[PDB]
Amino acid sequence: HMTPKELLEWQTNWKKIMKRDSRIYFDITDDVEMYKSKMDKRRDLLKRGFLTLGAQITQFFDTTVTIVITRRSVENIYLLKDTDILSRAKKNYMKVWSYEKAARFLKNLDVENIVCRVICTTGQIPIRDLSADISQVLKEKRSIKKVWTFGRNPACDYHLGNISRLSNKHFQILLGEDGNLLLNDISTNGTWLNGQKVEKNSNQLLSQGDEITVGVGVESDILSLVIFINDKFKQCL
């Protein structure tokens, strides 16, 4: 519920704090894991991301520390001994972040031609673009010029992720004559366009800001793409 302007202000402030006076400590204790070396790799990735922000990493636990980042469960810190630095950190009202939260934080601080710009507004997928060779496109005589496939399969032109009720080949975006994009559902569980379920194996014309929604029926697998069609493409086609 943060507006674009609010979230931008939120970001500006944190970058400011990170650069000037954040002091991050990485908890060296773990819960036994059944090869520590994998989380040592994800750890050093986090450290470099924070260094990218101009923040200072500490080798020892001070009270000058502003954030501690840990692999151990934050939920169970109250069960640790009083000497444990996670226990001491929380009781002194210090920030205690999970590796996931830290990676999530760093992501939020930014650490052929374009047919359209696909934007997943539910989060899961980064901003991707659809590409097509223009000279090759006008060369084609067939009615359908190019064909992007969306689906559960990471072999598709657009990977929708490993979702429960999706399909290896879920739906398609077809490029037609005269620079028009259209939509084609081939899934078995369904595709939606602006809240309306589209007819399977039937080409529906896409418009500006049209919202493709799949995985309807489970609020976790849900996925909404908004298509922002490039005007220059048709304006030169």
From Swiss-Prot:
Family assignment from sequence similarity: Belongs to the protein kinase superfamily. CAMK Ser/Thr protein kinase family. CHEK2 subfamily.
Source organism of this protein record: Saccharomyces cerevisiae (strain ATCC 204508 / S288c)
Comment, domains: FHA domains are phosphothreonine recognition modules, FHA 1 strongly selects for Asp at position +3 relative to phosphothreonine, whereas FHA 2 selects for Ile in this position.
Superkingdom of the source species: Eukaryota
Annotated protein name in UniProt: Serine/threonine-protein kinase RAD53
Annotated compartments: Nucleus
Note: Present with 6900 molecules/cell in log phase SD medium.
Source taxonomy: Eukaryota, Fungi, Dikarya, Ascomycota, Saccharomycotina
Modifications made to the protein after synthesis: Autophosphorylated. Phosphorylated in response to DNA double-strand breaks; dephosphorylation is mediated by PTC2 and PTC3.
FHA domain boundaries: 148-198
Description of how the protein assembles with itself and partners: Interacts (via domain FHA 1) with PTC2 (when phosphorylated); the interaction is direct and serves to regulate DNA damage checkpoint signaling. Interacts with PIN4.
Full-protein positions shown: 30 to 155 of 821
Known function: Controls S-phase checkpoint as well as G1 and G2 DNA damage checkpoints. Phosphorylates proteins on serine, threonine, and tyrosine. Prevents entry into anaphase and mitotic exit after DNA damage via regulation of the Polo kinase CDC5. Seems to be involved in the phosphorylation of RPH1.
